[PDB]
Amino acid sequence: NMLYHRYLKPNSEYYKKIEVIYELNDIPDTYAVFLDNESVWKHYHVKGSTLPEQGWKIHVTSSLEDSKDVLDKVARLCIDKKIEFKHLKDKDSFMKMNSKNANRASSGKFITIYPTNNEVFVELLEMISLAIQDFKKGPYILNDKRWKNSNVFYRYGGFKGIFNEHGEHCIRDKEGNLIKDQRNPFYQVPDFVKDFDDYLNTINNSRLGKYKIETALSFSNAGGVYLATRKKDNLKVIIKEARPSAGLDGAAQDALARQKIEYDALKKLKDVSGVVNLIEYFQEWEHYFLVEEFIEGRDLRQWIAQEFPFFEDNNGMSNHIKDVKMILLQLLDLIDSMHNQGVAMGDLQPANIMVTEDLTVRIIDFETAMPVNSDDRPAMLTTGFVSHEMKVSGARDWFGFKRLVRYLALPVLTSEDLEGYLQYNHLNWIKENYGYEFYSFIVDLQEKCDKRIKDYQTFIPKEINLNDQTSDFNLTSIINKLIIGVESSLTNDERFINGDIRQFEMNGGKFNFLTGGSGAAFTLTKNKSSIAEVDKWIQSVLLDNLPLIEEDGLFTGKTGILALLYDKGYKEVVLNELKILKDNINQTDISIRSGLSGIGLFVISLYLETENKEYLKLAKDLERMIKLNRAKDKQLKVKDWMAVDIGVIDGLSGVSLFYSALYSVTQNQKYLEEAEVLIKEDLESTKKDDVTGVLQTVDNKNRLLPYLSGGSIGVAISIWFLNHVSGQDLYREEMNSILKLSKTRCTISGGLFDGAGSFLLIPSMVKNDKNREVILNEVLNLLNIFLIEKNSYYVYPGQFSYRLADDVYTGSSGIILALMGVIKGNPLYWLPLVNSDEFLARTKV
């Protein structure tokens, strides 16, 4: 999710890879020097010799500057000893592996060393500590054991590739001959080489009982944060660990700086009782613990989540108005207070501000604190509350408040790339739902900040004119203008369109229906638009790439694409591809998104189109695989960080779609009961709200979810479809409680799967025409928060509205499909099925 930062190429309206060397030569022979597919590592390879099926490996840790020497020093005591090693290929690589938000299990590992075996191991330990004795002690590797007092670390693990089906990394044991690889924040020795480990344990040569330490709040490569309780009191407090040379930021600052800068600037700000005050500070162990004054309550984000009203509750937004009044009024002086110390709050956003059960406001976390008037580029930028045209420290602090002013009124993230367009959208929304009163409060407070910025630097903003943006409630009007938008933003690269970051981050994401070109290609074909562009792209990109997409997934892989190809007349190609699917794999993934259910759904839809019984036989075989997989365990493993194991996309609700569909074509009642059951098991994990009348799902992580991906809207689609195939009206009461989500006021994001776009599906399920209109009209209000007028047409913001996207997952294609569903009264139209314009009629009872 933090990956979005990586895709903010400046001066683009789309998510695009931010482009950015550890040199060295005097390279001997059969020293083959290569990179990878596109990894961090640079392999220095010798000769040709089986390096063990696993073994004892050495990691050298280094710090950023030394690094250049640390490589030259170790590389020679490796080149001259003709040893095999890899190092992080460049500065960007070092940053990412050591940054504040790198994985703990992998950080610090700068150079990896592979000794032939245990003697040269227990001897490179020696000959390497020595060459790097005069070098600043770098980040500690938490997965490894430290050797003596050095930057040299060791662990037992794999030297190349060892995977257990889908089960992470491994190392071939003996009887089991697999043993998965424990990459963890501690040192987790195997067992079959326990012998050699203890050997090394004897050749390797009350200040925190002060407090009890129960829970951990958060971790992070910089350190941790704990739920403490100092006896001599019972004063619950918050302790901030700081591992030196660890969690690097973008300024070359380590997790030491941001504790003695959350010191130099926590000091000056001791004289303000909004701000946080410290307990002590000390160099306990090699680390550091700056104990913090504990503050009960919730962060603003958590308050918004639980207290901001989402249900259209007819009178009572004023409740929230006074609250935004209580809070923001203070904060406005609390920032005034701070500024007479000469010190900038650095990173102002709803995470770093707290709120009790009586609306008391305090600013925590001071890793970013700077000198007002100074323009050193800030440490961590929080996109959505900053802009890269503020030059001076102080200005930036106030701009954070500015953006945050509106945020509390309408909590919808935006970035300084899209805020130009969406300011119009949100202000008009606020005016419409709060009154001119609250609108005015906002405008001024935001002109106030404009003052306190003009104090610091040249900053003439552009002015109002809300009338320049108006809502569109005509479905056909929206479709057409979103289409033109897509037609107006064809890349002419392999992707066909700009989509989510999963385009670059995930297997097949440039091509597949979910974020790839197939999804826009498909949608353009539905509106009979851009035919030659679609053909060009199919002809010169897609076909060539098809045989190379590894996944069979409906959204993630080949099957979605095959739907497009078949509907475009490429029967032969689908035909050949199906010949290969029948065997391809019967995986353990049953999801609609990427598993056997989504594949089986496609297969059924192809059977309907072709009337060829081979495909029915294939659908039945897939069922048998799903059934068994369902038996393997009542759990779902996950891949995509936004996935959850409930609902129509990644949950059992989606598995039910397959069963319904298979029902429609077999007439076998057994499948119908499996469908009902799979729904049922999902309904069990819903939470009906007593206050407001709405059913949402409930995830493991104790989120309440409305959306198509993970939430109740999806569940409803599965019910609607069961009913459609069987002729029943099951779960009518839970169905009604889900459609009540129509009254939702806002969502953080806009998209089909994870945002406002989900709600569009609600109307396609309502059987009444008469309540369809009220409902349609409500969800269009939601959508108009996100619709962007641009030239003559519309474009659509991707996730978190930081950048535009045209894809199915987040972008305009997802929305176009949803709006066409409404028209057609088809809540399944976002599915990439063969001739999906006949599908409903062909599956109807």
């Binding site: 938490l142 129960e214 951990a216 704990y226 090699e286």
Partner: peptide, 14 residues
Amino acid sequence: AMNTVLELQKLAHD
């Protein structure tokens, strides 16, 4: 000493 400081990294969550 470092049996605690490192054992902390091991501690509770949700």
